[PDB]
């Protein structure tokens, strides 16, 4: 159970942030989710302080992070960091990352 700030969207499906799926053990194959509204003011304050997603990044079981990137993210990053022996722009010297982006894009 976690609290989120809603953003109005079209459609009849709830949109769930990807990083938290691991925490929910949620899968997009017809799994459904329930949504409750805290009524009194103390409940609202409790939700925003104690239960909000950003406040729960470490698992209560062990200390390690729960929101680690799962599958697509890690694949993209892996592709990004691996190097190749020979390519375009071998061995030129750049003054910083900004022109690196200039060159790649």
């Amino acid at each position: 159970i976690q609290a989120f700030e809603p953003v109005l969207i079209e459609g009849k499906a709830i949109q769930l942030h990807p990083l938290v799926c691991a925490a929910y053990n949620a899968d997009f194959d017809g799994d459904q989710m329930a949504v409750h509204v805290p009524l009194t003011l103390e409940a609202q304050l409790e939700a925003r302080a104690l239960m909000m997603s950003t406040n729960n990044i470490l698992s209560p079981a062990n200390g390690e992070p729960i929101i680690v990137p799962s599958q697509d993210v890690v694949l993209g990053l892996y592709y990004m960091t691996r190097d190749c022996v020979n390519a375009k722009g071998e061995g030129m010297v750049l003054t910083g990352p900004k022109e690196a982006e200039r060159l790649y894009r």
């Binding site: 109005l8 969207i9 030129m92 010297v93 003054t95 900004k98 022109e99 982006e101 200039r102 060159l103």
Partner: protein
């Protein structure tokens, strides 16, 4: 028929070289078409001035060492890449640097010529040590469009040049960084409309607003030939 034209063009210019620009609301799908067109035009085709070649009085190859500069030659080339100069009338001009004594040789120490203005007088170039501190060089700056790497000129160097002719990468375009995000924005019933936030960092010379101005201007002059419904 009747389209939806953008209003409320807000621009938050923190740190004059860094400008965030917000644009809403935009018809469906035009976010990416327009963002990408602008980005490519800004990045690839922009008239500017930049350092092209350099002659060192002391070293014949880029890996040799000059006595009394702790920084290697490559560091000097990298410092010269950052030089943002604006010349007014002449097309190609040759600046001379001659410095002695202890301390940081900065852009200000260049000989003050007529048409050329160095926007950043405090940009470090070299560090000179004690009692010898002899630095002399001739840097040629030219006008051009876009980005020109060293490799493409050095390829076509069958025209043999005297030793010391050190080629430098030409950074003509004044934009150092450009990016655009597109995000959802709804007019009270239609949700599939989008806002374009363009974050741009330039290299001092021109302020971002006017950069955008001439970018949009350029694309419009090319398009001008067909557009006639007015």
């Amino acid at each position: 028929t009747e389209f939806l034209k953008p209003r409320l063009v807000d621009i938050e210019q923190v740190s004059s070289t860094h400008a965030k620009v917000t644009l809403e609301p935009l018809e469906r799908g035009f976010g990416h078409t327009l963002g990408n067109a602008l980005r490519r035009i800004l990045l690839s085709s922009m008239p500017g001035c930049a350092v092209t070649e350099v002659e060192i009085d002391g070293v014949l190859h880029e890996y040799s060492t000059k006595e009394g500069v702790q920084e290697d030659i490559l560091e000097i080339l990298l410092n010269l890449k950052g030089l943002a100069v604006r010349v007014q009338g002449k097309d190609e001009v040759i600046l001379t640097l001659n410095k002695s004594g202890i301390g940081p040789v900065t852009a200000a120490d260049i000989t003050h010529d007529g048409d050329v203005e160095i926007v950043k007088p405090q940009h470090v170039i070299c560090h000179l040590t004690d009692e010898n501190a002899s630095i002399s060089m001739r840097i040629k700056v030219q006008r051009g469009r876009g980005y020109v790497p060293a490799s493409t000129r050095i390829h076509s160097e069958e025209d043999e040049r005297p030793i010391g002719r050190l080629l430098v990468d030409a950074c003509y375009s004044p934009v150092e960084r450009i990016a655009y995000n597109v995000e959802a924005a709804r007019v009270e019933q239609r949700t599939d409309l989008d806002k374009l936030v363009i974050e741009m960092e330039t290299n001092g010379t021109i302020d971002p607003e006017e950069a955008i101005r001439r970018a949009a201007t350029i694309l419009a002059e090319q398009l001008e030939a067909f557009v006639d419904l007015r």
